[PDB]
Amino acid sequence: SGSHSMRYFFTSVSRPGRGEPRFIAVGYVDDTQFVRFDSDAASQRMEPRAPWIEQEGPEYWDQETRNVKAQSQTDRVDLGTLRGYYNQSEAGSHTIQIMYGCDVGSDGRFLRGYRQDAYDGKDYIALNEDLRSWTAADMAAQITKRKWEAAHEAEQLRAYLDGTCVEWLRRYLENGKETLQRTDPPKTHMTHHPISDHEATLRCWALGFYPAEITLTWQRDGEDQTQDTELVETRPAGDGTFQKWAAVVVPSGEEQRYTCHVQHEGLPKPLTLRWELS
Amino acid sequence: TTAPSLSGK
Amino acid sequence: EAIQRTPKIQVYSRHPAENGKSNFLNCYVSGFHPSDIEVDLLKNGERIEKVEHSDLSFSKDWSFYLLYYTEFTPTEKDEYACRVNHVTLSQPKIVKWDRDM
């Protein structure tokens, strides 16, 4: 709590006979996007997406643009290599996904680093939390692991994940402190929707919260209900906050027996919500 | 800022 | 590709909806793979033209998500929906805006 992260997400998607692969790079501080590159957008530059990063100079934008474009070229070569390892044709569209970054404490101290790679939406290879070894998902990925071990890839990446990554994350938190060093606890309420004369949906709501992590749980007489609960994915409002809900179908007249429990880092107590007619 | 690119898979 | 995940579609407003007060209409599409997708926001069945979208990103299970959004003023009578096309769908899926979810 009061922890922070910097994360970059990359997606390369091949489109044989329709051009070079689509490449999309996104950077986030905590749950706030600050940069993007999209091969299909107008500029072919890394571009600002938060007002505090705009104050960076032309040399910052030049270097990020060159660096992001080299990530793109590597992924494009990898799309060819992995197609060979998995023995797939030149005609289908394939996907490489990559995420890496670092976490720090509320005092700016390194907590951890991570990098994970996927191929066609499944684990390919990951850097382990010790930042000195890899885990491959299958025997194709172990060929990559051998190359990366021989080339000492983890040692160069580690110096970025616990040095460069952390110091820039500390800079961005400072440059953006008015916006990024905030916690918005969820504004919660409960709604009630009959589905018949004899049953109704209780929906437990959390709105306006930041950062995005939250837990919503239904209990009946204090016994868990996780298998009869509908949960939706935590969704963005578009103003920098998030929303979520969880619902349970109940017998009309037994509403007061159910409770909804809300856990967010910005909440003094865990909240307990209950539908009471009287 | 983004990391240097790893070598090929 | 080897795996295919059907998109989960949510259609909601940025703020609690109030008739006659401008707001934002959101179509959040998540949990899908592969990434090729088409999303349109609809007003009384017609395609809204000025619609923005977020940069493609993804979850822990590698499934993709995107947000499409546009300025609107909710009324009692106007029907809003989101239309999504994806390889996992037999036809394009239309999800209607409902103030209660």
Author numbering:
A (entry chain A): 0 to 277
B (entry chain C): 1 to 9
C (entry chain B): 19 to 119
Give excerpts from the publication:
The WT β-catenin peptide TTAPSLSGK (amino acids 41–49; hereafter “WT peptide”) has been previously shown to be presented on human B cells using MS, likely in HLA-A3 (39, 40). The structure of the WT pHLA-A3 was determined to 2.2 Å, and that of the mutant pHLA-A3 was determined to 2.45 Å. Both WT and mutant pHLA-A3 exhibit the canonical fold consistent with previously published structures of HLA-A3, with an RMSD of 0.483 Å between them. In the WT pHLA-A3 structure, the serine at P5 orients laterally, making it accessible to antibody binding.
MHC class I complexes are formed between human leukocyte antigen (HLA) proteins, β2-microglobulin, and a peptide, typically 8–10 amino acids in length, derived from an intracellular protein. The peptide-binding domain is formed between two α-helices, with an eight-stranded β-sheet forming the base. β2-Microglobulin is a single domain protein with a typical Ig-like fold and binds alongside the “stalk” to further support the HLA peptide-binding domain.
